[PDB]
Homo-oligomer: A and B are copies of this chain.
Amino acid sequence: ECRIQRLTAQEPQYRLEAEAGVSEVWDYTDQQFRCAGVAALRNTIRPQGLLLPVYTNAPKLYYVTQGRGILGVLMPGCPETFQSDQHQKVHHLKKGDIIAIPAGVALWCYNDGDEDLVTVLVQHTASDLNQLDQNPRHFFLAGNLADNVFKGFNMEALADVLGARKVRGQRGHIVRVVIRPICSATFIQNIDNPAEADFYNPRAGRLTTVNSLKVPILTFLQLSAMKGVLYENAMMAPLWRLNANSVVYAVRGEARVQIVDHRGETVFDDNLREGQMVVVPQNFVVVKQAGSRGFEWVVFNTNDNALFSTAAGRTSPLRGIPVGVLANAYRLSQEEARRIKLNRDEAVLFN
């Protein structure tokens, strides 16, 4: 399931055009995603576009690559706290936001901005919360792997449950053209803003994480994400993730990216570029050196608490264990063990 000889920088493989947008779907059936147990989507919502309400059998983490809009989530059996129409609290979407949506909860979204609203999506199909298959399934309540639920039911059986029903809706799933244009849980979190970075080096870059200790619901989703920015010529320390697979999506720039497994054979050594998506399995080691225009990425991780282990750096295992072990391991002399030890004073982002 995860015996992989090589890794791939992937882009969508089939499109899904609608009236007011497009859904580009990665081949979740490729071995790169099968192993990661994720399904990668991209949603583009033109101005005035409305994504019809949908729910999925699996948890979901959206990232807002571009645009600004309004979002509406539906928790079961909770009153409406927005009353003028009466409905639940809509949410404000802005570039750099992370959205966590549980499995089975309905969500709609509308693009009330002048720029295309681009959101990248991963669906964790290997999560215990998903009790169906390891393939994406979208239950729509309108419109139209995916389809509109309301369709299936009878005209009359459904007639006498409510006082008529063309809720059996081909405009696609994003159509053209609210009060403000448990259940008090925070689902949005700013990740792309610089002021709220976690790691920072004015010469190397910055790292911002979202996880269970920032957004509580993630404890239930067992997902997380990291927004990374590398300036020109800076590099990311070589690292492996202890308890999760990684879904890296390149949002800007270019960077050389290398990946290694147990057998010591490199499965990936290529230039990642904006719009591409690479997967870094668990315990596989990455390393990035930004290109000429820097590099910016988002990595989706499949665990509540994503820990890293940097082969080299201030918080590096090599820095942790004795010089003797280093010398006897890598034959060279005591002082070049010290060299491999205490020469990089930086943590994980480097000049």
Contacts and interface: CB of A to CB of B under 8 A. Distances in A.
Nearest to A104: B242
A212 to B, nearest CB: 7
A283 interface: yes
Contact of A87 (B81, B311, B320): B320
Contact of A91 (B110, B196, B267, B350): B196
Interface in A126-184: 126, 128-135, 137-154, 157-158, 160-167, 169, 175, 177-180, 182, 184
Contacts of A76: 242, 307-309, 315, 317
A340 interface: yes
Interface stretch (A8-16, A22-30, A256-264): A256-264
Given A81-B199, A161-B287, A216-B216, 15 more contacts: A79-B79, A81-B347, A104-B283, A105-B242, A106-B321, A130-B282, A139-B261, A145-B262, A153-B260, A160-B289, A163-B344, A164-B340, A180-B202, A185-B213, A186-B213
Interface residues of A, number: 163
Contacts of A318: 141
A231 interface: no
A223 interface: no
A72 B322 CA distance: 9
A282 B129 CA distance: 10
A45 interface: no
A283 B238 contact: no
Interface stretch (A114-122, A270-278, A291-299, A330-338): A330-338
Contact of A264 (B151, B175, B216): B151
Contacts of A185: 213-214
Given A89-B200, A179-B200, A281-B132, A264 B330 contact: no
